[PDB]
Amino acid sequence: NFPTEYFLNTTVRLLEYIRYRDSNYTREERIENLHYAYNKAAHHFAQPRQQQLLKVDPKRLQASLQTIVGMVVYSWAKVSKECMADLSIHYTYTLVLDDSKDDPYPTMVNYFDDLQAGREQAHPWWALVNEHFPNVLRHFGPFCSLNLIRSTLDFFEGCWIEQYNFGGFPGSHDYPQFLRRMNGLGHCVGASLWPKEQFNERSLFLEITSAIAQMENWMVWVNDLMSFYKEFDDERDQISLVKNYVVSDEISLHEALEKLTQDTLHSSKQMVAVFSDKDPQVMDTIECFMHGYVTWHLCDRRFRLSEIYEKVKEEKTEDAQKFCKFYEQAANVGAVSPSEWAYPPVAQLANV
Amino acid sequence: ENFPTEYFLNTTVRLLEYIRYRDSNYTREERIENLHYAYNKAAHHFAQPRQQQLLKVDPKRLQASLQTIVGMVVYSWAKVSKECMADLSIHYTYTLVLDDSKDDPYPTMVNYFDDLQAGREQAHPWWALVNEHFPNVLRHFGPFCSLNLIRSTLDFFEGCWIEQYNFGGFPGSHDYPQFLRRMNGLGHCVGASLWPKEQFNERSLFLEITSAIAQMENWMVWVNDLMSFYKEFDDERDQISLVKNYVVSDEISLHEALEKLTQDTLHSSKQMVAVFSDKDPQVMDTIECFMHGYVTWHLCDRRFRLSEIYEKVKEEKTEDAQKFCKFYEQAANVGAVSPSEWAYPPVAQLANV
Ligand SMILES: CC(C)=CCC[N@@H+](C)[C@@H]1CC=C(C)CC1
Ligand SMILES: CC(C)=CCC[N@@H+](C)[C@@H]1CC=C(C)CC1
Ligand SMILES: [Mg+2]
Ligand SMILES: [Mg+2]
Ligand SMILES: [Mg+2]
């Protein structure tokens, strides 16, 4: 049974400590970027090649795409429309894999030789991601690029490990976070925040590196907390930082949630301490990302947090009320109807 | 000021007890057979004209580096084949050498992905040599382990990039220190290179391997930080290290920073045993031998100067001081080997031929 009571307690503390407040866009801008990113991505995923090598159920691709276009647009508020679109494609390729069930082993036997030789990878996912990667990379300098490349490779290994539905040997205190960094795309996300068009990678090398290092944790932990609801009675998940803290450190689900919350509140505290007296343009990007990322969690269908707002809409219990106020705050800014941007469906473009 | 000899001794002794440091069926003669085999293959590789011209390293430094790495590999990867130790000695010597360059990677990384995707030789000479040699290392492993080596080496490259900035982290940037240490730790490379497919079934042992990688990453780097603490204590050239970065980033004292490292190191040690004690025998043995050899390597290799500590507490009636000396003599007994017995001829001589 889902610990609704604690779920509220934990989420509320987080939203209050960070003083959640999304002011990233005017409703017209939001809609304008959502459509742009979706349109370029939709046309991309509708091509016969992408349609045939990417093994995904149409209704699932469509949902994944709209979920990512939101994530990108809602959290990368300061980058260009082109950048948002190209990033939306990359992170859609990753989300599709994130929910998948496949054995990479057979198609990874000649990974390095094919890579070094320039031959197309045998694993369809890599074939599509690597072929499209330059469209994402043209937006960044060499350092950030390397970070995106590494993180995507890490993420791939992370989905691989998860295929074994293994949560760690009891007593393996390092396994939980080892896996979370693997599947976190932390460095990919943190480095994709600095397009060379807006930032000089050599002038801000230290601030960017720091942002990557620190934002990696804040970023993953926030999702571990916000996405705790959709992940639970879900088979594909189960193997999560929270539930692995349970199996590996042999503690109660209750203690795992509290542990995660303290890490996050701490990660949040230091984000502020370090990036307050720094380059304004840098702070702005971090700020927009942090608040926007939270708005996306409270709004997007993938996380089904409305199924908790409705089942807690009543009953006054301090947390329950504080949660619904936040849920509404975000709902008022990012609860944009799909029919206003996510059109036409990918399936329709594919069969044109 | 003044090295915490007491605290240091206690921590090391506890470390060696927690891991069950003890004698092994690995002799001195076998070590010498392995040392010379790995050294000989590596020396011939680095003495080739191509390697000699793309790897801008001072010859004496290359010579000393190769000898440090061969020792590390032959002593810690005790269960793998001679070829495997040899090929890993080459890879790890390449990585250790990358630290000798100040040259900004930026200009050479502008087209990293495009050259990689197209199959054109990388612009950064280091990658050119390393990627060209990698298959010799990879043939010894399954696809999963391979991927780990590849990632960790890519991580290591970025780590060296970052280190060129001599940056210990902004005060209050608590996550910076460990983020950096993992970056250039090679943990996943090390951890996964302990399971040759010839001796292990990556698929059947997937869970124990993934677990060893996870736990070995932190053990391997923290033990090195701990044992390197003496050699880096007064060294004003070494300005950024996990411990010094904890000081700058967390805003605590060198002492408190050392305490943090100790607690992590010791804790990591207990869980290593507590997790692999009952698991598969061949696996626990590889893990068991890695920890012991890794420690022996530190105690015997002169780069860490631990003999200076041994030679200073050699005659004190303290308990720790004695257990330390005892341990050290166990190490020296089986590991203190003269380079003239295996490391010959010098790479330079092979180069002129
Ligand atoms: C998007 C996918 C495929 C997986 C979720 C992994 N998380 C670590 C997120 C990755 C993207 C952002 C913006 C934040 C953290
Ligand atoms: C080899 C030395 C000097 C120290 C041990 C620390 N590890 C993190 C090493 C980093 C570089 C290599 C090649 C292997 C592992
Ligand atoms: Mg995932
Ligand atoms: Mg998931
Ligand atoms: Mg999640």
Curated annotation (Swiss-Prot), chain A:
Residues given in the record as Mg(2+) 3 binding sites: 237, 239
Can you tell me which residues bind Mg(2+) 1? 98, 162
What is stated about the way this protein's activity is regulated?
Benzyl triethylammonium cation (BTAC) acts as a competitive inhibitor of trichodiene synthase reaction in the presence of pyrophosphate (PPi).
SUPFAM superfamilies noted in UniProt: Terpenoid synthases
Q: How is the cofactor bound?
A: Some of the cofactor binding sites show unusual localization within the protein.
Pathway where this protein functions: Sesquiterpene biosynthesis; trichothecene biosynthesis
* Result after altering residue 293 to F: Does not affect the catalytic activity
**What family is this protein classified in?**
Belongs to the trichodiene synthase family.
Q: What is this protein called?
A: Trichodiene synthase
Q: Which organism is it from?
A: Fusarium sporotrichioides
Q: Which gene encodes it?
A: TRI5
